[PDB]
C-alpha cells in the first residue's frame, strides 16, 4: 500500500446537510458541510485515520458494520439499506423493522434464503420443504428424527 488505506478505490467530496443546536437552542440546517464518500468499504481502515471522525463512520455494508459494531448497529444498517433501495415511494417504516428484526434475532445477520431459514427455524421442516428443495429437507428430517 502506498498513500492510502486498503479497500477503497475512489474517494469523492460531497456536500451534505446536517442539523445543529445553536447557542440559543435553535435547530438550524447547515448546508456548507463537506465530507468524503468513498467507493469500497473499510470501516477499520478509516477508523485508524486521524483526519476522520471515527464515531460517525457510515458504511453501506451490513457485514462490515456487523463485524465491527455489532448486531444492533447491523439492525439499523439493514433498515437504512432497504430504505435506500425502496426510494421515496416506499413502504412504511414498520415494514423495514420486520426485515431487520427477523434477520438479526439470533445475534447474527441471517439471510432470506434456504440457509437463513435453516438457522432461524431448524425444526420447521414443512415450511423448509416448501421453500427450495423438499427432497433434501425430507431426507435430513428423517435421519435426525
Amino acid at each position: 500500500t502506498i498513500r492510502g488505506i486498503p479497500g477503497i478505490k475512489n474517494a469523492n467530496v460531497v456536500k451534505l446537510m446536517r442539523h445543529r443546536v445553536d447557542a440559543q437552542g435553535k435547530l438550524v440546517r447547515l448546508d456548507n458541510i463537506y465530507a468524503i464518500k468513498t467507493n469500497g468499504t473499510n470501516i477499520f481502515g478509516a477508523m485508524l485515520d486521524d483526519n476522520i471522525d471515527p464515531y460517525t463512520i457510515v458504511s453501506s455494508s451490513i457485514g462490515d458494520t456487523m463485524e465491527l459494531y455489532g448486531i444492533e448497529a447491523a439492525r439499523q444498517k439493514i433498515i437504512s439499506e432497504i430504505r435506500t433501495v425502496m426510494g421515496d415511494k416506499g413502504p412504511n417504516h414498520r415494514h423495514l423493522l420486520m426485515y431487520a428484526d427477523l434477520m438479526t434475532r439470533t445475534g447474527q445477520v441471517t439471510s432470506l434464503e434456504k440457509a437463513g431459514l435453516n438457522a432461524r427455524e431448524p425444526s420447521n421442516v414443512l415450511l423448509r420443504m416448501a421453500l427450495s428443495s423438499p427432497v433434501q429437507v425430507l431426507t435430513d428430517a428423517a435421519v435426525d428424527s
Binding site: 455489532g70 444492533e72 448497529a73
Partner: protein, 205 residues
C-alpha cells in the same frame, strides 16, 4: 495506526468496566518497545470483587501467534500464578483469529480451566470507545431478578427472547457472560425510541 489506538482505548475499556489498574502506566514508545521485544504487552486490573483481569496485547508478527507451543506455554505459565484470576483478554491481530492451531490451544486452555473465562479478540474491537459510537444503541446489563420479573409478567422463557453473542462488541465492553440479560435502549423512527431485552449466548470463538 492500530497500536496507537490500542494504547489509549484499552485503558478506556478498562475504565469503562469500572476496574482499577494495578501496574502504573508507561509511555507509548516504551509500550511499542515491549511489544517488539517480548512479543506482547500485559495489563492488570482488579474488579470490585477483587477478581483479577489480565489483558494481553499480542504483536502481529510475534512468535506467540505463529507457534502454538509458545501460546500454550505462555497461557500455562500465566494460569498457575497466585492471583485471583477471573478473565484473560487476548487481543491479537485479526488474521490470528483465523489460525486453527491458536484457537485449538485456546479451547484446550478453556477445557483445562473451567472456572476462568478465556477470550480472544481482534484489534478493531479496542480501537474506539465502542459505547460512544453513534450507530451503536445503549446496552446495559440487567440483574437476574429484573429479568425474571420481566419474563414472569410476559409468560416468557430465556430461550424465547432475542439472543446476542457474548463476543458482540458492546457486550464485550459491558462484560456480559452467556446466560445474562442485556437491556438495549435504541432509537426508533416510529416511537422515537424503544427498549428490548436480549439473552446473551456463547461467544463465536
Amino acid at each position: 495506526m492500530a497500536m496507537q489506538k490500542l494504547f489509549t482505548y484499552i485503558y478506556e475499556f478498562i475504565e469503562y468496566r469500572k476496574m482499577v489498574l494495578l501496574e502504573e502506566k508507561v509511555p507509548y514508545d516504551k509500550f511499542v518497545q515491549m511489544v517488539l521485544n517480548t512479543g506482547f504487552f500485559r495489563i492488570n486490573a482488579e474488579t470490585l470483587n477483587h477478581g483479577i483481569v489480565s489483558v494481553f496485547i499480542f504483536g502481529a508478527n510475534g512468535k506467540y501467534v505463529h507457534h502454538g507451543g509458545d501460546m500454550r506455554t505462555l497461557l500455562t505459565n500465566t494460569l498457575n500464578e497466585k492471583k485471583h484470576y477471573e478473565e484473560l483478554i487476548l487481543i491479537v491481530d485479526k488474521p490470528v483469529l483465523s489460525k486453527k492451531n491458536i484457537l485449538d490451544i485456546i479451547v484446550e486452555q478453556r477445557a483445562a480451566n473451567p472456572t476462568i473465562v478465556i477470550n480472544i479478540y481482534p484489534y478493531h474491537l479496542f480501537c474506539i470507545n465502542i459505547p460512544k459510537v453513534s450507530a451503536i444503541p445503549k446496552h446495559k446489563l440487567i440483574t437476574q431478578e429484573e429479568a425474571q420479573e420481566f419474563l414472569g409478567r410476559e409468560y416468557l422463557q430465556p430461550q424465547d427472547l432475542m439472543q446476542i453473542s457474548a463476543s458482540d462488541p458492546p457486550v464485550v465492553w459491558l462484560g456480559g457472560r452467556p446466560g445474562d440479560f442485556v437491556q438495549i435502549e435504541r432509537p426508533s423512527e416510529t416511537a422515537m425510541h424503544a427498549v428490548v431485552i436480549r439473552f446473551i449466548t456463547k461467544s463465536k470463538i
